Amino acid sequence: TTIMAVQFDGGVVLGADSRTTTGSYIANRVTDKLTPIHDRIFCCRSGSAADTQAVADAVTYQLGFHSIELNEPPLVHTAASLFKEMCYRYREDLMAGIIIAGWDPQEGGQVYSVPMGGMMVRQSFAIGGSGSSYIYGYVDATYREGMTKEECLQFTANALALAMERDGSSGGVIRLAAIAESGVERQVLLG
Amino acid sequence: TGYDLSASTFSPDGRVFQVEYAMKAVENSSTAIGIRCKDGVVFGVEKLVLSKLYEEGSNKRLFNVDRHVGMAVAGLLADARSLADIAREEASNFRSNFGYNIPLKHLADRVAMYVHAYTLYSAVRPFGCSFMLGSYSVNDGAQLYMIDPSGVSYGYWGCAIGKARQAAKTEIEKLQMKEMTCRDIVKEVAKIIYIVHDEVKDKAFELELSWVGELTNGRHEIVPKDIREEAEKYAKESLK
Amino acid sequence: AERGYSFSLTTFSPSGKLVQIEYALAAVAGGAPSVGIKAANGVVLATEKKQKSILYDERSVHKVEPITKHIGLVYSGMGPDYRVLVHRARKLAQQYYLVYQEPIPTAQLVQRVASVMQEYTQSGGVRPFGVSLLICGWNEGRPYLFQSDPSGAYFAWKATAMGKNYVNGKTFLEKRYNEDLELEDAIHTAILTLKESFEGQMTEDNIEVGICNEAGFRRLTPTEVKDYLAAIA
Amino acid sequence: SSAGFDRHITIFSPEGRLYQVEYAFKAINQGGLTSVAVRGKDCAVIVTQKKVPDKLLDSSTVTHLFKITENIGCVMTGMTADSRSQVQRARYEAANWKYKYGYEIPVDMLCKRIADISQVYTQNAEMRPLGCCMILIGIDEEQGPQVYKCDPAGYYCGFKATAAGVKQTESTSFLEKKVKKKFDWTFEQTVETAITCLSTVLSIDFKPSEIEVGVVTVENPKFRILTEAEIDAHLVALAE
Amino acid sequence: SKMNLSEEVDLEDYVARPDKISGADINSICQESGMLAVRENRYIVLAKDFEKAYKTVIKKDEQEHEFYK
Amino acid sequence: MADGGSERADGRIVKMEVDYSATVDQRLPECAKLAKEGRLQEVIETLLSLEKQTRTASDMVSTSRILVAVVKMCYEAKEWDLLNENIMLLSKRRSQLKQAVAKMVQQCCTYVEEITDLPIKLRLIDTLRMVTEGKIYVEIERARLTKTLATI
To answer: Which residues does the record list as N6-acetyllysine (modified residue) (chain E)?
Structure first.
């Protein structure tokens, strides 16, 4: 549920929770919210799982046939434009929790947030999740400008731990995702 | 004996007569050439004069499909404006769903799938237009592609269609092309443009020139005659 | 007249014979020999596949393409339009299987396919199928072997043969094969009539013998083909 | 035999033969290219070339190497116009199987789904048969590499090593004797025999920059091709 | 037998590949196969002499159709 | 290449008499790269002869002693090698081998009278295959005739 995206100079760093709860009952104890669209382009999903999977599968088919025909690097901004057009037309039906964060050869690491309205905007950091209401004051203070990939794993762990421990929906094991020119990096942390 | 009737059928020599008639159909039209420098791409069009004929600066074969892309076309003019709107509508689909500049490689590929398709069916007919596609971008660079009515997609540093003179592209290797900044290039091409295509065939003529590249920051427009004026300035004194 | 959507190109000759459909029989005659035998417990098929060059490996392309687990089949003559009706029969055999809940007999494959195959010949603008299908399998405890033609007419033969010199191999299958025999004896005379027009070289990849068991169709690998036929028949 | 207007459309003949389809035999001759496929134990190697009549030819744009999937590439012959329309269709059904099925693609039976669309091209009422010839490689799990060459009659074809085209008939003659007998195949052994099989045909033996050698070997399953570097080293390795 | 031996030259490969391209074009093209031995320039006819003789006449153009075999 | 063959060969002529035979064996890779190019027409025929010139000047040195002709079987090692990488295709410019071999057998004409027949027949058994490789090409056929008359 709770999702986080932070961009540093040479890429972006993503994180998400595992435990997902439908009502009072827990649907799944361990769930990976990151979507492997492409090696250089990831996103974080929330809300309805069925709506986030198919749209990610649609862009994978759309861009996949397009990007392979390009024989070009996987441009991040154009991939997020496919989410912008679809979430805007379906905004009265589909629910959009996708936030596109990925490293690009030309434009570097960038984060694009696409809320339920379908708009696309670039910011230095991204926030999301139901448990993010309590950390809104914490994310607007502890966050610093010009972060490093090292401390990005620490800061995303501080933002998720406060949201997962307080809010009842978010929880489980903490999983982080690091994106840079060296490729995809994932890890499992707890406590 | 009638093997040239259906455009969907082959020929006793194993080729398409509809395309063979379409290749020379573009040759009878006036010459429209193109060339690309390092930071830019240059276009040109010849305008023939028989009687008057009409106002200068009319029905020029130079068209602008997109911000960074342009059209140098030859052959039947009405078939070119139809492909100009198709390329314009295709450029509208790219700027909508995506919102950035359409790469010249796949922009020529979309038209390559079209021009090829009309040659396959006997219902419709092939195209009598062989045009030039070129563009420049900061993240791409200068490319130039030569499209033929048969539907083959490819490009060189330069190509020539229209009338068969072909001597206007000879002096280009005698001058600096990829080394030059594309500024003086405009007036360097126009020298033999006037010399060759002798006045015996056509008494008078008129020349159009267009350019797209870094100096315009990716924009494409026809170079005005008053600015920088050195286009036809150096062209008159270079005839010898 | 009308559209140009490919109205029927098939007309009637002054004697009433079909024009382009009878020409598809020439492709069957100018094709490759394929034989099959309906005897006793099940049906046995013997086809012929020979490589035009030494660089061809028969382990990839398979002549036998069974429609159902219990239904085998082979063909004669002409591939490109053959795979069209094959996969079409895969989609068509599902309505009988989903609605009636049953391993559809070969007789129903004959009625449905030959009707569409006849409708395909009636539709113009397209060349009729030059493929003569041998339909076999096991249903209701008694197997069947049925032969179709480009025109759609379906027959029933104990031992049948198609391809080059099919009238000569039909007389051999009329004499050497009679009444009914076991599947092992059926494979014997099925290769002997295939070795008629076959070249002087017979290996595991030169001939492939399919068999329809009462338990359902089982396609034999080239292993069992070289074991029984070496030493052909 | 021929009667009536059958010469002017695509259909059968009074003798049951074909004319249009058989005129596609020499449809490759106008291109005048050659492609030969050689497969090894763990590897598969394709050899092709291109013609450079003018120095303006760009190596990237006129490149005849087409890449369908990262793991599986391809190559074409004949006129390049009909080939490009089949390129996206080979990419289309590819992405369909990557999306829906999610694995290494029908390394064996993919030629059936492609030839089906290629047969629709032939089976259409009035349309061009598209005489371009499709050639694919393949990668499977513990099956070794695969090589497949499809022809635009609507049928699927592929084997260990196959060469079909203008001059490819003499190339297979050497491959029949070279493979067996009995022999194995290594990486450089298949690259060295890619020239020798063509050496029985023409092999002008000039600078390698014009010839393109496709290669796929299983270490990293992703298909890929180097640029100009060690291809010349493999050319001087086979000649001692 | 009228050709020079051919005690070295092995008839095995010439009864296969040249047999594919035969017209026929039967009787006296085999004599042309011997009339390319006078083209030599070689004491005992080379393998390239035979193969070159039959491959010129007559040509075949394949295969989009007969592939059913 | 023309200039490449003149600068390397004329600079290695001092290595023969002054320096040891190690540089003579180390002379192989550079002179081979010159023949790998094949810039021809007749230049490399004269270029590689300068090697074969001082190489026959080393025949005075080496083949006399020391000793046993093992240095000569190393010569045919790089005689076969010199024809390996060119490949020269029995051309053009293959005459660099004729005058070489003709001067090689000219030394063999002096060896039979100067030294016993044992080392020269091991030298003659090597050039029997050199003639099979030397065709049928010009005088190499009659260089076979003069050496086989000596064997009789």
So the answer is: 48, 52
Peptide bond into F92 cis (omega under 30): yes
Helices F70-82 + F43-64 axis angle, to 10: 170
Nearest chain D residue to A60 by CA distance is: D99
Pair of tokens at residue B108: 């020529």
d(CA C19, CA C124) in angstroms, rounded, equals 12
Count of CB atoms within 10 A of residue B98's CB?
A: 18
> Closest by alpha carbon to F37, among F48, F49, F25?
F48
Q: Sign of the C-alpha dihedral, residues C169, C175, C180, C185?
A: negative
SS3 call for B234: helix
Tell me the Cα Rg of chain D: 19
- The amino acid at C15: S
For B93, the 3-state DSSP assignment is helix
Are residues B69 and B186 in contact, defined by beta-carbon separation less than 8 angstroms?
no
CA distance D33 to D48: 8
Query: What is the spatial distance between Cα D28 and Cα D79, in angstroms, rounded to a whole number?
Result: 6
Tokens encoding B88: 């314009």
Beta bridge partners of D66: D74
Handedness of CA D163, D167, D169, D174 (dihedral sign): negative
Dig out the tokens for B32 from the structure.
């429209």
Residue E68 to residue C79, Cβ atoms within 8 A = yes
Q: What is the CATH number of the domain that holds C221?
A: 3.60.20.10
List the catalytic residues of A: 1
DSSP state of C130: -
Domain encompassing residue C163:
1-233
The pair of three-digit structure tokens given for residue D131, joined into one six-digit string: 């005489």
CB neighbours of C55 closer than 8 A, spacing ≥ 6?
A: D159, D160, D161, D162, D172, D175, D176, D179
Subunit contact D155:E67, Cβ cutoff 8 A = yes
Contact A111, A125 (CB under 8 A): yes
E17, E61, E64 ranked by CB distance to D151: nearest: E64
Residues from E in contact with D at Cβ < 8 Å: 17, 55, 61-65, 67
D26 has a chain E CB within 8 A of its CB: yes
Domains of chain B: 1-240 (3.60.20.10)
Distance CA F16, CA F23 (A): 8
Method by which the model was determined = cryo-EM
How many helices and strands, by DSSP H and E, does chain A display?
A: 4, 11
Residues 50-109 of D with CB under 8 A from B: 54, 56-58, 61-62, 79-82, 84-85, 88
> DSSP label at B156?
B
Looking at residue D89, its amino acid is R
Provide the token pair at B122: 């006997």
Q: How many residues does chain C have?
A: 233
Sign of CA dihedral F32, F36, F37, F43: positive
Q: Sort strands A174-180 and A125-127 into parallel, antiparallel or unpaired.
A: unpaired
- Quick one: which of F46, F23, F49, F34 has its CA closest to F104? F49
CB B38 within 8 A of CB B178: yes
D68 near D139, Cβ under 8 Å?
no
For residues D21 and B10, give the distance between their C-alpha atoms in angstroms, rounded to a whole number: 8
Query: How many domains, chain C?
Result: 1
The residues, any chain, with a CB within 8 Å of residue B101's CB and separated by 6 or more, are B66, B67, B68, B137, B140, B218
Q: Which residues of E touch C31 (CB under 8 A)?
A: 68
